Design a binder for this molecule. Structure first.
Ligand code: NDP
Length: 301
């Protein structure tokens, strides 16, 4: 009966409060999380009604776990109306790179490659769903806390198979902050390419979303702590573009469910949401390369 949405990384921050807001709207939320105990705990602490959500294990750092999640979701027999790619990792105090179960640098492997496989797999479920209005939302960047800009180069690391000791998409020296930025740029390019390749054929809406500066989540906590040691007058709610976790989740819920956000191939940013189209140019060319190589790394070919 209830429309069904999958949210990755729903045990914390934006994903958790997006699930809360979507449950309030009458949806059934699949909480695709790696830590089943932590997820159940925070779902109870916020009083989620048990008939409105289901917890299924997903570890985006293990490609076979991504396939196992899809198999387990299909066992439920719920038609898939929406997918929110929300989970992300950032390691602000990392000197040397960490590796995924498939020997890919952890940030890109989790934030991008895991989601990339999940989107390509779940595209068949979104197609099979009979609803006219079906949406795939990707949490992205500000425009279409870390001052270093992302730089994919010519994907030399991807072209070489991206296996360790390769640590960056352009095969340069590992930097954990730039690694996060590079992986979030890949999310944005995935949205561009999903729209270009599949919107006309399938009718599915493919958009990215910047919910605002959600300073209270754990993601950038170390940056805020470092700010306080230098500026002791500093609090998180004074950050530029600060939004609460509850409001961020409501904005996710709007982009998933509301009629105002039916256009495909745009980036929603924040107040009543500014829209940015993803047209053509230089990043459209990068997106095509990003897609082709990512298919090889995740075993789709
Ligand atoms: N916070 C901000 O200010 C901004 C955030 N964003 C985007 O919003 C999204 C959420 O960020 P935020 O909510 O702040 O970060 P949080 O750390 O608060 O939530 C991160 C979520 O990702 C999940 N996750 C991490 N690794 C994996 C994995 N390998 N497999 C499955 N789930 C995983 C975590 O699970 P666990 O609970 O087990 O850690 C957690 O639930 C991200 O995509 C981020 O890029 C964009 C702009 C600003």
């Amino acid at each position: 009966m209830k429309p069904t949405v999958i949210i990755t990384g729903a045990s914390s921050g934006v994903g958790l409060y997006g699930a809360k807001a979507l449950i309030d709207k009458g949806w059934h939320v699949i909480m695709a999380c790696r830590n089943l105990d932590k997820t159940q705990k925070v779902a109870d602490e916020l009083g989620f009604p048990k008939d409105s959500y289901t917890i299924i294990k997903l570890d985006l750092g293990y490609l076979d776990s991504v396939r196992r999640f899809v198999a387990q979701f299909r066992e439920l027999g719920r038609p898939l109306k929406a997918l929110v790619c929300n989970a992300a990792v950032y390691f602000p105090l990392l000197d040397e790179p960490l590796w995924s179960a498939d020997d890919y640098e952890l940030s890109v492997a989790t934030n991008h490659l895991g989601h990339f496989l999940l989107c390509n797999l779940l595209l068949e479920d979104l197609k099979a769903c009979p609803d006219a209005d079906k949406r795939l939302i990707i949490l992205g960047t500000v425009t279409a806390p870390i001052p270093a800009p992302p730089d994919l180069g010519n994907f030399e690391g991807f072209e070489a198979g991206f296996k360790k000791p390769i640590a960056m998409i352009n095969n340069k020296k590992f930097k954990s902050g730039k690694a996060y930025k590079d992986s979030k740029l890949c999310n944005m390019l995935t949205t561009r390419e999903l729209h270009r390749r599949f919107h006309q054929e399938t009718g599915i809406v493919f958009n990215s979303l910047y919910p605002g500066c959600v300073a209270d989540t754990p993601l950038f906590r170390n940056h805020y702590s470092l700010f306080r040691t230098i500026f002791p007058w500093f609090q998180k709610n004074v950050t530029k573009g600060y939004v609460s976790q509850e409001l961020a989740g409501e904005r996710v819920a709007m982009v998933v469910a509301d009629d105002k956000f039916k256009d495909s191939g745009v980036h929603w940013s924040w107040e009543a949401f500014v829209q940015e189209l993803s047209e053509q140019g230089s990043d459209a060319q990068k997106a095509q390369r990003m897609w082709d190589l990512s298919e090889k790394l995740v075993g789709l070919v």
